[PDB]
């Protein structure tokens, strides 16, 4: 689809069997999701942006369906105010910026 | 152009006659630039990011070029980790997300 930017580019995603709303963020290197349970081992990570840093848990090889498109990659879990789909997964679903 | 997301979508912008680098950010409502001098009066604005909230200076009707495309709008100036071009200006250059 072609998503216009008059409003926040929010889509429904499915991760860990759960349906969540997420923001397609071209300004995010990683994918960050609110507290939830994910399978596998994890390692701590600090991520920053406006307002500073937050500590998150890094999970690898996580599958997530973004607006009907499945992608696999690293997913960070933590106290993010918004569920964010970053570039690591945006590339997988073939998302591009066009103008 | 069509911008893929394998690397950060950084473009050259021109504001106040100066060339700077900025991130095309679909996850940003507004455009936030690092400390610099802009003409006219400014109003207060509080914005939120991944790590919390920061106070910025809001300047309206600022002439700014984004990757060769001219825009005139609101530019927020403050302690942002990176210059980001938000949806307010992305809509002016006719940018869309596509997949
Ligand atoms: C400034 C750093 C680059 C852009 C930034 C945009 N993030 C979005 C995420 C959505 C909110 C959690 C954002 O901050 N958007 C703001 C930008 C400011 C603005 N005003 O446009 C926004 O739209 N804020 C809205 C409100 C959104 C909701 N906020 C809230 N409920 N508190 C607003 N009007 O203030 N990206 C990031 O913060 C990501 N950081 C990065 O990709 C890299 N970090 C750095 C510092 O470059 C990497 C080295 O970690 C985070 C997510 C980790 C992957």
Swiss-Prot record, chains A, B:
Provenance organism:
Human immunodeficiency virus type 1 group M subtype B (isolate BH5) (HIV-1)
Q: What does this protein do?
A: Aspartyl protease that mediates proteolytic cleavages of Gag and Gag-Pol polyproteins during or shortly after the release of the virion from the plasma membrane. Cleavages take place as an ordered, step-wise cascade to yield mature proteins. This process is called maturation. Displays maximal activity during the budding process just prior to particle release from the cell. Also cleaves Nef and Vif, probably concomitantly with viral structural proteins on maturation of virus particles. Hydrolyzes host EIF4GI and PABP1 in order to shut off the capped cellular mRNA translation.
Active site, renumbered: 25 (for protease activity)
Annotated protein name in UniProt: Protease
Every copy of the Peptidase A2 domain together lies at 20-89
On subunit structure and binding partners, the annotation says: Homodimer, whose active site consists of two apposed aspartic acid residues.
Region (Dimerization of protease): which ranges? 1-5, 49-55, 88-99
């Amino acid at each position: 689809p072609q998503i216009t930017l008059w409003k926040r580019p929010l889509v429904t995603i499915k991760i860990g069997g759960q349906l969540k709303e997420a923001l397609l963020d071209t300004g995010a290197d990683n994918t960050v999701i609110e507290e939830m349970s994910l399978p596998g081992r994890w390692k701590p990570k600090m991520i920053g942006g406006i307002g500073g840093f937050i500590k998150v848990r890094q999970y690898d090889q996580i599958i997530i369906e973004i607006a009907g498109h499945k992608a696999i990659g690293t997913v960070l879990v933590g106290p993010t105010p918004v569920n964010i789909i970053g570039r690591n997964l945006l590339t997988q679903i073939g998302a591009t910026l066009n103008f």
